[PDB]
Amino acid sequence: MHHHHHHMVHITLDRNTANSWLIISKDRRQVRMGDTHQNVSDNKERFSNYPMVLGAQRFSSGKMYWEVDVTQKEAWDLGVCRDSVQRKGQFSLSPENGFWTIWLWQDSYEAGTSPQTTLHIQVPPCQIGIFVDYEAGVVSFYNITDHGSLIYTFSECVFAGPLRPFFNVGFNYSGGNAAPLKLCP
C-alpha cells in the first residue's frame, strides 16, 4: 500500500574526486583532512585547491535525503552541486556556479547564496540533513540537533542536469578541525 514515508539514500564518497590530501575510510562513508599527500593518482575529476570531494551518487530527478555528521569540526561546506562543476582552481560556492551549499567558517554559519546569507542558528548542528527535490527546484538543510529545524531552503533552483552530493572537510592547519565528515555506516 502507498504510505507517505521518508527514505534516506546511502551516500558514499567518490575517491576519484577527492582532493589528494583527504583520507577516506574503507567503507567510503567518512572523510578527513590528512597531513600528507595520499597514494592516489591525480586526474581531471579531482578538486585541486580545496579539501573537497563529491558523493558517488548522481541523480537528475526525484527526491534525495542524506545526513552528515559534523561533530567537533570548526570548518566545512555541505550541499549538492551540478555534476559539471569546475574541479580545478579557485571558485566561489554559489548557484551561479552550480552549488547549493551551507558552511561553517569561524563560528559563523552561512548559506552559499550570492552574496552569502548569514544563518542565525541557535543550536550548533552535530548532524545536518540535506534534502533535494529535483522537480520542485528545492535544496533544504535541516538541523538534526534542533529536532530537524529548517536551517535554509534554496528554492527556484536551476539544476540544469545531474546533481552530486558535495562536501568540503575544511583545512586543519589550526588543529581544531581534524574530525571527519561522516555519512551513515
Q: What is the CA radius of gyration of the chain?
A: 16
Contact status, residue 12 vs residue 55, Cβ threshold 8 Å: yes
Domain chopping of the chain, boundaries? 15-182
Instruction: Give the DSSP letter string of the chain.
Output: ------------B-GGGS-TTEEE-TTS-EEEE-SS--S----TTS-SSSSEEEBS--BSSSEEEEEEE-TT-SEEEEEEEETT---SS----SGGGTEEEEEEETTEEEE--SS-EEE--SS--SEEEEEEETTTTEEEEEEGGGTTEEEEEE-S----S-EEEEEE----SSSS--PPEE---
Q: What is the resolution of this structure in A?
A: 1.3
How many angstroms separate the most distant Cα atoms in the chain?
Answer: 53
For 143, residues 6+ apart whose C-beta sits below 8 A from its C-beta are: 121, 123, 125, 128, 129, 149, 150, 151
CATH, domain 15-182, list 3.40.1160.10, 1.10.3720.10, 2.60.120.920, 3.30.1490.20 = 2.60.120.920
Experimental method: X-ray
Q: Is the peptide bond before 162 cis (omega within 30 degrees of 0)?
A: no
Instruction: Quote the CA–CA distance of 23 and 18 in Å, as a whole number.
Output: 9
For 12, residues 6+ apart whose C-beta sits below 8 A from its C-beta are: 27, 28, 29, 55, 56, 57, 183
Q: Which amino acid, residue 64? A: M
Neighbouring C-beta atoms of residue 150, cutoff 10 Å: 12
Grid coordinates representing 57? 551518487
Measured CA distances, 100 to 13, 27, 93, 159 (Å): 18, 26, 7, 9
